[PDB]
Write a protein that holds these residues in place. Structure first.
Motif, PDB file in Angstrom:
ATOM      1  N   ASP A   1      14.600  -6.352  -5.788  1.00  0.00           N
ATOM      2  CA  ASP A   1      14.137  -6.237  -7.195  1.00  0.00           C
ATOM      3  C   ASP A   1      13.039  -5.167  -7.248  1.00  0.00           C
ATOM      4  O   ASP A   1      12.049  -5.298  -6.501  1.00  0.00           O
ATOM      5  N   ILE A   2      13.215  -4.155  -8.102  1.00  0.00           N
ATOM      6  CA  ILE A   2      12.239  -3.084  -8.275  1.00  0.00           C
ATOM      7  C   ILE A   2      11.426  -3.443  -9.510  1.00  0.00           C
ATOM      8  O   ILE A   2      11.994  -3.590 -10.589  1.00  0.00           O
ATOM      9  N   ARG A   3      10.112  -3.635  -9.350  1.00  0.00           N
ATOM     10  CA  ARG A   3       9.252  -4.026 -10.463  1.00  0.00           C
ATOM     11  C   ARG A   3       8.004  -3.154 -10.471  1.00  0.00           C
ATOM     12  O   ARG A   3       7.202  -3.227  -9.544  1.00  0.00           O
TER      13      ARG A   3
ATOM     14  N   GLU B   1       0.828  -1.207   0.000  1.00  0.00           N
ATOM     15  CA  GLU B   1       0.000   0.000   0.000  1.00  0.00           C
ATOM     16  C   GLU B   1       0.863   1.258   0.000  1.00  0.00           C
ATOM     17  O   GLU B   1       0.432   2.292  -0.505  1.00  0.00           O
ATOM     18  N   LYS B   2       2.061   1.166   0.593  1.00  0.00           N
ATOM     19  CA  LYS B   2       2.986   2.332   0.696  1.00  0.00           C
ATOM     20  C   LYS B   2       4.074   2.317  -0.391  1.00  0.00           C
ATOM     21  O   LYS B   2       4.525   3.415  -0.769  1.00  0.00           O
ATOM     22  N   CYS B   3       4.481   1.136  -0.871  1.00  0.00           N
ATOM     23  CA  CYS B   3       5.537   1.045  -1.883  1.00  0.00           C
ATOM     24  C   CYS B   3       5.036   1.549  -3.236  1.00  0.00           C
ATOM     25  O   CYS B   3       3.950   1.164  -3.662  1.00  0.00           O
ATOM     26  N   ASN B   4       5.834   2.391  -3.912  1.00  0.00           N
ATOM     27  CA  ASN B   4       5.467   2.941  -5.218  1.00  0.00           C
ATOM     28  C   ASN B   4       6.525   2.651  -6.292  1.00  0.00           C
ATOM     29  O   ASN B   4       6.437   3.194  -7.392  1.00  0.00           O
ATOM     30  N   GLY B   5       7.490   1.797  -5.978  1.00  0.00           N
ATOM     31  CA  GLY B   5       8.544   1.423  -6.917  1.00  0.00           C
ATOM     32  C   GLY B   5       9.506   2.548  -7.237  1.00  0.00           C
ATOM     33  O   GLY B   5      10.029   2.611  -8.348  1.00  0.00           O
ATOM     34  N   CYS B   6       9.759   3.436  -6.262  1.00  0.00           N
ATOM     35  CA  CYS B   6      10.680   4.555  -6.458  1.00  0.00           C
ATOM     36  C   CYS B   6      12.108   4.066  -6.769  1.00  0.00           C
ATOM     37  O   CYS B   6      12.840   4.746  -7.487  1.00  0.00           O
ATOM     38  N   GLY B   7      12.464   2.888  -6.260  1.00  0.00           N
ATOM     39  CA  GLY B   7      13.745   2.245  -6.539  1.00  0.00           C
ATOM     40  C   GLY B   7      14.898   2.597  -5.620  1.00  0.00           C
ATOM     41  O   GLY B   7      16.024   2.151  -5.852  1.00  0.00           O
ATOM     42  N   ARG B   8      14.638   3.379  -4.571  1.00  0.00           N
ATOM     43  CA  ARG B   8      15.697   3.823  -3.672  1.00  0.00           C
ATOM     44  C   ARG B   8      16.316   2.680  -2.838  1.00  0.00           C
ATOM     45  O   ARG B   8      17.533   2.663  -2.642  1.00  0.00           O
ATOM     46  N   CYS B   9      15.501   1.736  -2.357  1.00  0.00           N
ATOM     47  CA  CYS B   9      15.988   0.641  -1.516  1.00  0.00           C
ATOM     48  C   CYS B   9      17.031  -0.258  -2.208  1.00  0.00           C
ATOM     49  O   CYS B   9      17.950  -0.744  -1.548  1.00  0.00           O
TER      50      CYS B   9
ATOM     51  N   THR C   1       6.090  -1.605  -7.295  1.00  0.00           N
ATOM     52  CA  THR C   1       6.401  -2.309  -6.052  1.00  0.00           C
ATOM     53  C   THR C   1       7.869  -2.755  -6.006  1.00  0.00           C
ATOM     54  O   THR C   1       8.635  -2.476  -6.932  1.00  0.00           O
ATOM     55  N   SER C   2       8.262  -3.416  -4.903  1.00  0.00           N
ATOM     56  CA  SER C   2       9.619  -3.931  -4.714  1.00  0.00           C
ATOM     57  C   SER C   2       9.554  -5.313  -4.066  1.00  0.00           C
ATOM     58  O   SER C   2       8.568  -5.642  -3.415  1.00  0.00           O
ATOM     59  N   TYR C   3      10.598  -6.123  -4.253  1.00  0.00           N
ATOM     60  CA  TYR C   3      10.668  -7.460  -3.665  1.00  0.00           C
ATOM     61  C   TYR C   3      12.031  -7.667  -3.029  1.00  0.00           C
ATOM     62  O   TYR C   3      12.956  -6.904  -3.292  1.00  0.00           O
TER      63      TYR C   3
ATOM     64  N   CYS D   1      14.024   3.933   3.187  1.00  0.00           N
ATOM     65  CA  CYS D   1      12.850   4.055   2.327  1.00  0.00           C
ATOM     66  C   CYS D   1      12.194   5.414   2.598  1.00  0.00           C
ATOM     67  O   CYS D   1      11.785   5.680   3.731  1.00  0.00           O
ATOM     68  N   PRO D   2      12.084   6.292   1.587  1.00  0.00           N
ATOM     69  CA  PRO D   2      11.468   7.605   1.843  1.00  0.00           C
ATOM     70  C   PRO D   2       9.959   7.556   2.089  1.00  0.00           C
ATOM     71  O   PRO D   2       9.403   8.509   2.622  1.00  0.00           O
ATOM     72  N   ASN D   3       9.301   6.453   1.709  1.00  0.00           N
ATOM     73  CA  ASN D   3       7.856   6.308   1.840  1.00  0.00           C
ATOM     74  C   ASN D   3       7.447   5.374   2.980  1.00  0.00           C
ATOM     75  O   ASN D   3       6.266   5.058   3.104  1.00  0.00           O
ATOM     76  N   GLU D   4       8.412   4.936   3.805  1.00  0.00           N
ATOM     77  CA  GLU D   4       8.150   4.044   4.931  1.00  0.00           C
ATOM     78  C   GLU D   4       7.381   2.786   4.499  1.00  0.00           C
ATOM     79  O   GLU D   4       6.579   2.256   5.270  1.00  0.00           O
ATOM     80  N   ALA D   5       7.658   2.292   3.280  1.00  0.00           N
ATOM     81  CA  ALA D   5       6.994   1.115   2.730  1.00  0.00           C
ATOM     82  C   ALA D   5       7.636  -0.190   3.197  1.00  0.00           C
ATOM     83  O   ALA D   5       7.032  -1.248   3.051  1.00  0.00           O
ATOM     84  N   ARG D   6       8.842  -0.097   3.766  1.00  0.00           N
ATOM     85  CA  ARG D   6       9.569  -1.302   4.251  1.00  0.00           C
ATOM     86  C   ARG D   6       9.407  -1.402   5.771  1.00  0.00           C
ATOM     87  O   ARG D   6       9.691  -0.403   6.461  1.00  0.00           O
ATOM     88  N   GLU D   7       8.966  -2.565   6.263  1.00  0.00           N
ATOM     89  CA  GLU D   7       8.760  -2.753   7.694  1.00  0.00           C
ATOM     90  C   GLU D   7       9.655  -3.864   8.204  1.00  0.00           C
ATOM     91  O   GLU D   7      10.248  -4.597   7.416  1.00  0.00           O
TER      92      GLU D   7
END
Ligand code: SRM
Ligand code: SRM
Ligand SMILES: Cc1cc2nc3c(=O)[nH]c(=O)nc-3n(C[C@H](O)[C@H](O)[C@H](O)COP(=O)(O)OP(=O)(O)OC[C@H]3O[C@@H](n4cnc5c(N)ncnc54)[C@H](O)[C@@H]3O)c2cc1C
Ligand SMILES: Cc1cc2nc3c(=O)[nH]c(=O)nc-3n(C[C@H](O)[C@H](O)[C@H](O)COP(=O)(O)OP(=O)(O)OC[C@H]3O[C@@H](n4cnc5c(N)ncnc54)[C@H](O)[C@@H]3O)c2cc1C
Ligand code: SF4
Ligand code: SF4
Ligand code: SF4
Ligand code: SF4
Ligand code: SF4
Ligand code: SF4
Ligand code: SF4
Ligand code: SF4
Ligand code: SF4
Ligand code: SF4
Ligand code: SF4
Ligand code: SF4
Ligand code: SF4
Ligand code: SF4
Ligand SMILES: O=S([O-])[O-]
Ligand SMILES: O=S([O-])[O-]
Ligand SMILES: [Ca+2]
Ligand SMILES: [Ca+2]
Ligand SMILES: [Ca+2]
Ligand SMILES: [Cl-]
Ligand SMILES: [Cl-]
Ligand SMILES: [Cl-]
Lengths: 620, 155, 619
Positions: free
Chosen positions: A511-513, A493-501, A516-518, A534-540
């Motif tokens: 993997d940035i797809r 819900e928070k990940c947007n595939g920005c690719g920073r991680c 989203t990311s994996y 992560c600038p969007n706090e999508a990684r927990e």
């Protein structure tokens, strides 16, 4: 001539004339009357276990004391048996023989007051040995007991004899190998020393000197009923009279002037005269074996501890006087007492180095470093920093080693991280200091140091605590390795595939797809950089904690430790303790087998399942 | 494998079994003839005077020294099937971890449990071998679960 | 009654009476006159070097022959020295001593025709030993030469003695360990045997039997001038007269009936009477050491090869007759000749197994499998398939081993992949067969087999060829491992980020980003699946070929081989040869040290640097 390495100790007069070196010879080419003697050529030129058990080459007290964990319980008592004082030593030996605690007793008898080492298996024969012989004694009966095939024995000895016998018991820990093999390929046959009964001791004399001094005074040594030492005088009981002699009349053995041990501090139980009334014996119980004396005699409290301490100080002052005299006259000195402390090593040039046990996390107070700097400048010693973040003072003279160790001890700088024990715990700055730190390493290192610092083990045992998976302190090649880990999980819900991680991941596990990311969990090392950055706090945080490794090692060979699991601090302390217990239980070759070798030999599964069983049993 | 020579590679298999026979010397029968040291490929034996010794950090338990002693001075110290787990070959080599000696019933129970825990933790079928799943969850965590399931087994 | 393991060989009568077992004892507790004897108690009960050098326990000819690479050059000659025939053996020994080629000569002299083993360092003393002694001889002087400290010696011996001495020279290759240590912890003191001069031989007799049979015919052995064996008759020259006796009148040694070697086939040079004119000696040169005889005597061509072969067949027929007689009477037989072939092993139950060297790629013709099936059913043997894709016939009797090996050899099924040599090359189906195959593995395996099959080495040497990086035949744990690889590169003009390549990558080395794709070369194993399965042909070949590994192994311990580089087929053949040369040069313990152990001891850098230097010299 026939060369013998121990000749330097004997010819210099440092030799305690204890007779430990001759009973351990597996070829029986050594004999002892009043000093060691070679009756045949030694192929090793004395480079063997006669030299290695000598308490005057090295005391080895530090390694023996941390294992024996001696304590001090003061009592005094008397028995029905007539002895030197209260007859306590004989009463205790009689009890041990009668209750099947020992197969025989190694005691000193006499023929015209000439000491004779005897093996006693009957109580009636014990009474003949119940009296002090101030002439040089031997431990020869211990070799006889071995030839007889006796399984367990009790030995009575002077502090020097107790020290040599403790070195025999803990042989591999200081010798670094097993008992020497004779020409027949077998070690010396000796019984198990179940009890070590030590006597208080100020000095001993040559038999002929005692006889000649008594003869000059008109006393026949054979006619003497009893001898005694009190207030710097030798009491001689002959023809119902007490004829006093000054101890200076007799020639004290040179080795006694180099003695520091008055009360036989390494004995299971120490029996003496000082500190108790006449007709009683002072008793200092130091181990669980020595505790058995309570069943042999009625123990009474009220020992004069000050009288015993006065004697300890008088003996130490005499020792310091003799060492200073040898230094001034350029005489040979064996600095055997340097092994009373931890962190002591001998350099290639003959001088010593003193190792300060590394402080947790490599953090040192300015006062701590200043003290090391003051000592280095005062003694013109070189300052070395170790790769475990410890300190070493190089170029120390044997005369100053003890002074420096005690000076360092006063400032909290314990000397150690040397020998077969738990070495200084290695920790990185970790959480709160390093920007990559995920867990606290400084407090964990302090907890591990408080629980296991200088703990004895079959061989060196090294622990490392890393704050993150970068392993700056090498957790994967340590006996026990700890590494902070933080595994991620993606919130779609928070990940947007920005690719920073993917950019902050050194192992390239991400993997940035699209939007989203994996994460590839077969590559992810749990550094937690992708969560933090992560600038969007999508990684927990998926999983977090201290990852543990066991059986790692470096040195002559590299062995990678096995990844166990995440553990809590209490679990880590329990695990370290259990691993040490199972390591000690299965170790066969101290100073040669590391944890990894013992784990490999018994099997990792068998070894670790026992560690788990002991961990479940733990209630503290 | 029938012996520690590992002809079928037990050390690089998901589950490897190897026959082992460790020796112990009977000093009353040993006379230091020196024959056992010659049959030892790993050179774990030391011949000294009228006796012999074994370095158990080198000994692989091939039992040759017991079989070929002419004086029957070498006896069986320990015997059985030595088990390994998490071994693999192919794209990468992974050495299996030496577990312990196991009975046939124990081996069958162990193989079944390892498969259950492997299936429970596997995330990528046709990509993750047992070794990869064991490494990811941890060998300690993985093997302690295998042991818990083994104790529960009633058939 | 001192227990001695070799008593079974001696008491059964299989013993050749060569005397090799007694000269190797490091404790000197063995004596030999006409049979081996213990003069003191053996702590090993004969479980030692004496049993291991015995040519009648095992011939060990296969492992010795592949190393010696014997050839056959036929000549005949005569010298000025008066001998049994042309006096060639004595002329050669005289030359070797005079030209400082040997410190001494181990020869057989005599006292009243009773043989005596002697150490001769003087060329003049050689003449006294120049005649055939048909009574049992010993090799005792070889032990005296060792006590003397002689460095190099030449030894004359009967085929059985040559066989035992070859077993002494190649001791670790069949014994699997070094020379036995005595009570003083040192091996036996023996000189280096620089030359082995073999004699042709049909039989020998006990001295007392010869003396007894001669006495029955009114002849005093001590008065005999010369002896000779011609056309099954013993010629006795006494008092200027020639007396002919039938050989059957004398009692042939039981071990001679169990003998297969007539011409001493393992000698550096073999000297005999058959095949050459009277007064001349037949000479068979088999090695470079044996070639030196050309400087000692004038070699002449024209040897009658058929006459020598007729004797070889007569001796073989006598051997077959004796083995059959023992079988029928349930007497002990030692199947020592089974070691004349490769791929032979002894099972735990006493029977044998015959290993067929695996065919390249594990591919077998129907005609080949049918032959193995026919043999198995005929001999009621079990059929085993090996993990190197080879075949083993289990439950073979020692009486049938040789027949089965020669029968298999006729159909092209060579027995091998056993002992310290290059084992069967292991290859997967690879290119053309397997859908993952990137390179050809079958032809490469055939080339490697043709160049190195059964080549001697300090210990077993295994090669594996994989068609792709999946390593089905384990290239990373083989002495030399070959793996096909195909690394990718992305063409950005054709790549559209469809994402298909990342799905075919087992190692997950690919990253799909927007309208393109990338490869992590730290993860990529070069399987080439992403090139093959890209629907847009956007992935191309970056690098391609055979990736090579060296120093790997399995067995008692696992050692991973080191990744070298891509190599051409010619480079691979050159590399395999030079790794074997450097391995042989530095190996110290045959049958114990694998390539990995030798590489580790001398250093990988030093070892591989030398392999490269030798590879450059080939070109
Ligand atoms: C000072 C130090 C090296 C340095 O420059 O920093 C050091 C110095 C010595 N090491 Fe060490 N070791 C030191 C860290 C190591 C390490 C790494 C570590 O501990 O972090 C290793 C390999 C890691 C390991 O062991 O797991 C190491 C492997 C050895 C070994 C071989 C160990 C093995 O099991 O293979 C010995 C000798 C032995 O144990 O037989 C040894 C023994 C020694 C001795 C005491 C030589 C000896 O046998 O008496 C060296 C003292 C010479 C001197 O002048 O200090 N030292 N030694 C390190 C002391 C750190 C400390 O304060 O405790
Ligand atoms: C038949 C076979 C097992 C099988 O079920 O397939 C086998 C059977 C024997 N192996 Fe093997 N080995 C066989 C492949 C292997 C392999 C795998 C391979 O080569 O592909 C290994 C480990 C891989 C390696 O060595 O690189 C292997 C490691 C050994 C060892 C341990 C050697 C070492 O370096 O540690 C020995 C004993 C020795 O050499 O000391 C051994 C010795 C033997 C002997 C000959 C025992 C002996 O010394 O007499 C076994 C014969 C028993 C029999 O009835 O065949 N065998 N052996 C394999 C024959 C394949 C072939 O046709 O050549
Ligand atoms: C040389 C010497 C000096 C001593 N100096 C002091 C001292 O300065 N201050 C002090 O308080 N106590 C000293 N003692 C101890 C004291 O003499 C008594 O031995 C001790 O108090 C125990 O007496 P007991 O009546 O309890 O033992 P007992 O029942 O008399 O048993 C005595 C035991 O001592 C053993 N023994 C006797 N002589 C020797 C010897 N030379 N070496 C080893 N074992 C021996 C006997 O074998 C016996 O087992 C000394 C003892 C000795 C041998
Ligand atoms: C027992 C015996 C059987 C033989 N049978 C045959 C046969 O069937 N067919 C055939 O063609 N040739 C046979 N020979 C070989 C042949 O007799 C000659 O020895 C050979 O041709 C060499 O002759 P020469 O003149 O060159 O040797 P010479 O120059 O005479 O030298 C003879 C050498 O033989 C060695 N020798 C002699 N007797 C023995 C012995 N018992 N053991 C070991 N070494 C010994 C001596 O040490 C000496 O160096 C036999 C030899 C022997 C000893
Ligand atoms: S044989 Fe050993 S214990 Fe005896 S004197 Fe020599 S070195 Fe010392
Ligand atoms: S102090 Fe003791 S062990 Fe050392 S040389 Fe003297 S009698 Fe021997
Ligand atoms: S004072 Fe006592 S303990 Fe010390 S060396 Fe002398 S006899 Fe031994
Ligand atoms: S192990 Fe991690 S937390 Fe510790 S110093 Fe290194 S990077 Fe920092
Ligand atoms: S940095 Fe955060 S938002 Fe960006 S791709 Fe990674 S997990 Fe998603
Ligand atoms: S936790 Fe670290 S290793 Fe794991 S995916 Fe994130 S950045 Fe990579
Ligand atoms: S073979 Fe047997 S008797 Fe001989 S040294 Fe070995 S264990 Fe002892
Ligand atoms: S069991 Fe095998 S490896 Fe172990 S000592 Fe005996 S011969 Fe050596
Ligand atoms: S000591 Fe060795 S060579 Fe001699 S008889 Fe005994 S086993 Fe054979
Ligand atoms: S054939 Fe030769 S080595 Fe073998 S037992 Fe007989 S004489 Fe000895
Ligand atoms: S026939 Fe054979 S066993 Fe007999 S002496 Fe000749 S080579 Fe030796
Ligand atoms: S190694 Fe590759 S080419 Fe060979 S069989 Fe395996 S997957 Fe196919
Ligand atoms: S399969 Fe081909 S076109 Fe598709 S992302 Fe991969 S390289 Fe690009
Ligand atoms: S060649 Fe194979 S391992 Fe490399 S990126 Fe392509 S599919 Fe993956
Ligand atoms: O000093 S070393 O043993 O850690
Ligand atoms: O015989 S095994 O080494 O292939
Ligand atoms: Ca008193
Ligand atoms: Ca002739
Ligand atoms: Ca990726
Ligand atoms: Cl002391
Ligand atoms: Cl052999
Ligand atoms: Cl033969």
């Amino acid at each position: 001539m026939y060369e013998w390495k121990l000749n330097e100790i004997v010819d210099s007069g440092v030799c305690a004339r204890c007779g430990t070196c001759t009973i351990v010879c597996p070829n029986g080419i050594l004999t002892f009357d009043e000093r060691p003697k070679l009756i045949d050529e030694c192929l090793r030129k004395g480079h063997g276990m006669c030299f290695e058990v000598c308490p005057r080459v090295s005391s080895a007290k530090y390694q023996i004391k941390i294992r024996e964990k001696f304590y001090e319980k003061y009592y005094y008592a008397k028995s029905d048996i007539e002895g030197q004082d209260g007859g306590v030593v004989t009463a205790f030996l009689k009890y041990l023989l009668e209750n099947g605690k020992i197969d025989g007793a190694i005691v000193v008898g006499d023929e015209c007051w000439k000491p004779v080492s005897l093996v006693v298996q009957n109580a009636e024969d014990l009474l003949k040995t119940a009296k002090s012989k101030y002439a040089i004694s031997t431990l020869d009966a211990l070799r006889k007991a071995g030839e007889m095939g006796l399984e367990k024995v009790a030995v009575v000895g002077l502090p020097c004899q107790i020290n040599g016998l403790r070195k025999l018991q803990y042989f591999p820990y200081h010798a670094k190998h097993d008992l020497e093999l004779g020409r027949n390929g077998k070690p010396v046959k000796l019984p198990k020393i179940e009890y070590l009964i030590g006597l208080f001791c100020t000095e001993k004399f040559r038999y002929d000197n005692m006889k000649e001094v008594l003869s000059k005074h008109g006393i026949d040594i054979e006619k003497v009923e009893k001898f005694d030492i009190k207030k710097g005088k030798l009491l001689v009981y002959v023809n119902g009279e007490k004829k006093e002699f000054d101890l200076k009349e007799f020639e004290i053995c040179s080795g006694c002037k180099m003695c520091r041990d008055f009360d036989a501090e390494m004995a299971d139980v120490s029996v003496g005269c000082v500190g108790s009334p006449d007709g009683y014996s002072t008793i200092i119980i130091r181990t669980e074996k020595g505790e058995e004396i309570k069943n042999a005699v009625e123990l009474k409290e009220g020992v004069n501890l000050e009288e015993i301490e006065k004697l300890r100080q008088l003996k130490l002052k005499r020792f310091k006087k003799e060492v200073e005299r040898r230094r001034e006259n350029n005489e040979y000195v064996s600095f055997y007492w340097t092994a009373d402390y931890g962190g002591i090593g001998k350099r290639a040039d003959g001088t010593y180095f003193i190792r300060v046990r590394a402080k947790p996390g490599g953090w040192y107070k300015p006062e701590e470093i200043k003290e090391i700097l003051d000592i280095a400048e005062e003694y013109n010693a070189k300052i070395k920093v170790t790769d475990r973040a410890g300190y070493e003072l190089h170029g120390i003279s044997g005369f100053d080693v003890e002074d420096i160790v005690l000076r360092l001890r006063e400032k909290g700088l314990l000397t150690g991280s040397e020998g077969p024990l738990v070495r200084a715990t290695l920790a990185c700055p970790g959480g709160g200091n390093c920007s990559s730190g995920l867990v606290d390493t400084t407090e964990l290192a302090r907890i591990i140091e408080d629980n296991f610092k200088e703990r004895p083990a079959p061989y060196k045992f090294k622990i490392a605590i890393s704050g993150c998976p970068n392993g700056c302190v090498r957790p994967q090649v340590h006996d026990i390795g700890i590494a902070g880990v933080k595994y991620p999980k993606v919130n779609e819900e928070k990940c947007n595939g920005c690719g920073r991680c993917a950019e902050v991941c050194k192992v390239e596990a991400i993997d940035i797809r699209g939007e989203t990311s994996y994460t590839n969990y077969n590559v992810c090392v749990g550094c937690g950089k992708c969560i933090k950055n992560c600038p969007n706090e999508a990684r927990e945080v998926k999983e977090e904690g201290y990852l543990v490794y066991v059986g790692g090692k470096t040195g002559r060979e590299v062995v990678e430790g096995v990844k166990m699991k995440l553990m809590s601090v209490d679990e880590i302390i329990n695990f370290i303790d259990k691993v040490l217990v199972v390591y000690g239980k299965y170790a066969e070759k101290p100073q040669r087998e590391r944890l990894a070798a013992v784990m490999k030999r018994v099997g990792y599964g068998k070894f670790l399942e026992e560690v788990k069983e002991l961990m479940k049993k733990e209630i503290c």
